């Protein structure tokens, strides 16, 4: 059973946030209830309604007047609607569902901003027996990007940092990696950006420079 | 529903996290415990107060008393870094969280390997520069890093961020990022990023001179 969140990432005020949950591996008429609980970044859980196998809908009394959850048989999904959405809605989002033991998608950050999607530019942090090499992923709006190495191969000794919130409004993020300096000459290093917000993927070689 | 902050200790050590309620929800209705590592969902440790569902191990258990409920982890792994969260339900049926207390594991003071980086060519053909100090894989948290700009110290034109604790040694690691402006930037010849850490017998700096590279 997959659980998995896809709808904007960025919503404007007083503008409604739709979001989808597709089921996989399961069906929607045979969980005992399918629901919605939220995040805001750095906080704690907060849950804002449910549908259950009737068809019955429970809503938190906080939220009520602007949440509408509804299931799609069809196409085996569920769907969460929040209206006149505020700053206050910035969140990740969780879908979830009871099939004890309930599944959880993997959530989905949803902004709420007058500010538009800008995707990232990305710029090496070259290397020049320990060598420390990454990427900088500037400029972007909203969060999140997704930052691998070589194509995910590797993982090791890898890290990238919270994205910053700068003075302009735009987030910048930093990926390193620590590799042996004696692999710079044979090795490709490659970081692969992934900005969904504004369809923007990027897969830059950081080259040793010429010091 | 109320839990502290935070919990610390070394691997091979117990940890309890405490939930406090109220009659209406933990006094009346099951609890739940929920493990969420960095940029995962929350996943279920323990329900009905005492139960472990498959694939928990023993380390982890739960019981409640009268408005609270209490976590305990023993054996303390590396791999247990992460938010726990207990859950219950509220005078309406319907769930509610605590505030989540993370958990840290305690290990061996460690010193920072320190990295400089000057911009890109191809960010000041853009123009602007970053230029950024990386502290890497050091252990506590705590690190000061000072910018200076041929000796000028550098006030309020720098951010960083730091990573979760790494869940294979238990470090932090630390970016610096000092931005100027291309004009800015090709004024002046050195930069600097001087390290202070409870690791290091003095601070440490690395610099470069613009145009070696």
């Known amino acids: 059973v997959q659980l998995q969140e896809s709808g904007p990432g960025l919503v404007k005020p007083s503008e409604t946030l739709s979001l989808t949950c597709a089921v996989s591996?399961?069906?929607?008429?045979?969980?005992?209830?399918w629901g919605w609980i939220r995040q805001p970044p750095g906080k704690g859980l907060e849950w804002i309604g449910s549908?259950?196998?009737?068809?019955?809908?429970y809503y938190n009394p906080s939220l009520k007047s602007r949440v509408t959850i509804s299931v799609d048989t069809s196409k085996n999904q569920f769907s969460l609607k929040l209206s006149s959405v505020t700053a206050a809605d910035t969140a990740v989002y969780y879908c979830?569902?009871?099939?004890?033991?309930?599944?959880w998608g993997q959530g989905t950050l949803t902004t709420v901003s007058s500010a538009s999607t800008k995707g990232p530019s990305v710029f090496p942090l070259a290397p020049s027996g320990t060598a420390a090499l990454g990427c900088l992923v500037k400029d972007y709006f909203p969060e999140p990007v997704t930052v691998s190495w070589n194509s995910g191969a590797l993982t090791s000794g890898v890290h990238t940092f919270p994205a910053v919130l700068q003075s302009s409004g735009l987030y910048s993020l930093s990926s390193v990696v620590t590799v042996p300096s004696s692999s710079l000459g044979t090795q490709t290093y490659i970081c692969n950006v992934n900005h969904k917000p504004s369809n923007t993927k990027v897969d830059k070689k950081v080259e040793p420079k010429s010091c | 529903l109320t839990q502290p902050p935070s919990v610390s200790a070394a691997p091979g050590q117990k940890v309890t996290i405490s939930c406090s309620g109220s009659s209406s929800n933990i006094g009346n209705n099951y609890v739940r415990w929920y493990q969420q590592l960095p940029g995962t969902a929350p996943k279920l440790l323990i329900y009905?107060?005492?139960k472990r569902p498959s694939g928990i191990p023993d380390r982890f258990s739960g019981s409640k008393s009268g408005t609270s409920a209490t976590l305990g982890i023993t054996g303390l792994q590396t791999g247990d870094e992460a938010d726990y969260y207990c859950?219950?339900?509220?005078?309406?049926?319907?769930?509610?969280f605590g505030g989540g207390t993370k958990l840290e594991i305690k290990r061996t003071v460690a010193a920072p390997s320190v990295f400089i980086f000057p911009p890109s060519d191809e960010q000041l053909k853009s123009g602007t520069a970053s230029v950024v100090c990386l502290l890497n894989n050091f252990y506590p948290r705590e690190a000061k890093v000072q910018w200076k700009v041929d000796n000028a110290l550098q006030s309020g034109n720098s951010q960083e961020s730091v990573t979760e604790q790494d869940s294979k040694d238990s470090t932090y690691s630390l970016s610096s990022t000092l931005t100027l402006s291309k004009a800015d930037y090709e004024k002046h010849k050195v930069y600097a990023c001087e390290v202070t850490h409870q690791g290091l017998s003095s601070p440490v700096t690395k610099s470069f001179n613009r145009g070696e590279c």
């Open positions: 549908i259950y196998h009737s068809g019955s809908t």
């Open positions: 009905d107060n005492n």
């Open positions: 979830a569902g009871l099939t004890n033991d309930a599944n």
């Open positions: 591996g399961y069906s929607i008429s045979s969980g005992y209830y």
């Open positions: 859950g219950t339900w509220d005078s309406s049926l319907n769930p509610v």
